[PDB]
Amino acid sequence: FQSSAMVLRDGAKFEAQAGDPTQALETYKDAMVASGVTTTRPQDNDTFTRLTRNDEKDDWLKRGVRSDAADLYRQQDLNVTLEHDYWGSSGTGGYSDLKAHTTMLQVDAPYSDGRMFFRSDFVNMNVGSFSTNADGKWDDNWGTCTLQDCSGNRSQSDSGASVAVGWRNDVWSWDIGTTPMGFNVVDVVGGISYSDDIGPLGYTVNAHRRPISSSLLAFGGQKDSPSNTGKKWGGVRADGVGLSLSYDKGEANGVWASLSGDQLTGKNVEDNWRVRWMTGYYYKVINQNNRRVTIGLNNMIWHYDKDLSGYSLGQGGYYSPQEYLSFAIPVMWRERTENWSWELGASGSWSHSRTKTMPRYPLMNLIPTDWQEEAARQSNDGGSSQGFGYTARALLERRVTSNWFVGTAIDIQQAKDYAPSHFLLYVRYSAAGWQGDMDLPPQPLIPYADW
Ligand SMILES: CCCCCCCCCCCCCCCCCC(=O)OC[C@H](COP(=O)(O)OCCN)OC(=O)CCCCCCCCCCCCCCCCC
Ligand SMILES: CCCCCCCCCCCCO[C@@H]1O[C@H](CO)[C@@H](O[C@H]2O[C@H](CO)[C@@H](O)[C@H](O)[C@H]2O)[C@H](O)[C@H]1O
Ligand SMILES: CCCCCCCCOCCOCCOCCOCCO
Ligand SMILES: [Ca+2]
């Protein structure tokens, strides 16, 4: 025979796997008594979840009962999250002076042993106005304005709403969704991933189609000035696959690698592709239940076939170097108390970038025949540069009540890879209530475009 604690723990897992997680959570309440977590059966969810808070004096039985109960309870809870993200990057009026707002609403709920989500993103992107000459025209390296001075669409901005649905458990994940409807170029996007542990190392394989959100042109597309061609172009999407490996030795060390490759395609944009390699090593200087401090070394190497970072018609307005090398030293401090959880991090880096000389107008059939001779003699000069940069990030979340959580995050991107910075605020509602350990780190919503 087995001990009462073991019988109840086993029975709870059996009930959950059989499709009765509600009964399983009741059995975990009994398991807490039989295991010695408490002397009296919890009769409210706040008492129950408070008893799942980790305790470093726990032996393995008590530690597992708490963690198993907490994992099932979190998996079964209905959450609703509302988030606003203000993001962007400095640049040139009319196409890259980017100030953007994303508002996100997400509902998460159990399904089988995983969680389903339902998401809407509302995106507004403002890229400012073209600078004009006395005539009121401009000749920026954008659209076809270097082939004939442009007029008519001086102020540039767009807005749209996307939706997404998906599901994930510990083994696999999928999502399907859209890019914002209301933009010039609208697509179906999504992904699928599978994870397993072939011994000591973990791996994840995935396939995805995602937008490039770093500029309006790349994300939603723009229209050439009505004085010129008026053609829509942009809306670049990455269709590709990736493999990640992790040989986490447990304990204080860990290493990981990732190799991925994508086709990069858009509306009236020259075809492109990229392959990207990343590795990392990390060391846990402090590794406690409520405080984790890490320092690491990260490397990245990228290659894009073509430099389509220009904003002329036929290019895509996205960073696409032919050589990219980065070496970084990330540091991170994560900590939680009874009702707060935060992360503070930074990462100094050195990087090298090189781009080849490209035709400014790589798709000649978008160009009027009486402009094609002049277009063919226009090129974007290649270049290269190296330097130091950094990123920094702060995340803060607090429990207001059992049902209400609020958080902020700031993501400072100054590492010379043209990524935008982000500032966000969110509120998360727990239907059942949660008085267990805070999430470490906090988990804000990620804009769907950046999955
Ligand atoms: C026990 C340990 C305790 C640790 C506790 C940690 C808590 C620390 C608490 C304080 C936090 C301090 C934060 C310090 C990190 C922040 C870095 C930073 O912000 O500096 C930015 C700086 C860029 O500034 P800039 O003026 O442009 O140039 C400087 C020239 N040096 O950029 C830099 O700083 C330069 C960074 C250098 C990056 C070099 C990357 C080398 C990586 C090695 C790769 C080797 C792998 C071999 C690969 C083989 C081939 C694939
Ligand atoms: C297994 C690889 C090992 C890892 C290496 C990772 C480094 C990846 C960065 C590669 C940089 C790509 O750089 C690329 O080099 C080739 C030449 O070699 C150039 O190619 C250019 O020169 C060659 C030689 O005259 C011409 O045949 C070609 O028509 C021309 O386009 C590309 O214009 C450039 O974009
Ligand atoms: C820490 C406090 C958490 C606050 C909850 C955040 C909820 C997010 O609400 C989103 C609503 O914000 C709309 C702001 O509108 C921005 C203006 O839009 C740009 C138009 O140019
Ligand atoms: Ca529109």
UniProtKB/Swiss-Prot annotation:
Biological role stated in the UniProt entry: Required for maximal bacterial cellulose synthesis.
TPR repeats: 4-38
GO biological process: cellulose biosynthetic process
Family that this chain belongs to: Belongs to the AcsC/BcsC family.
Keywords: Cellulose biosynthesis, Repeat, Signal, TPR repeat
Additional remark text: The genes bscA, bcsB, bcsZ and bcsC are constitutively transcribed but cellulose synthesis occurs only when DgcC, a putative transmembrane protein regulated by CsgD, is expressed. Cellulose production is abolished in E.coli K12.
Protein's UniProt keywords contain Repeat: yes
The protein's name in its UniProt record: Cellulose synthase operon protein C
GO CC list: cell outer membrane
Keyword Repeat: yes
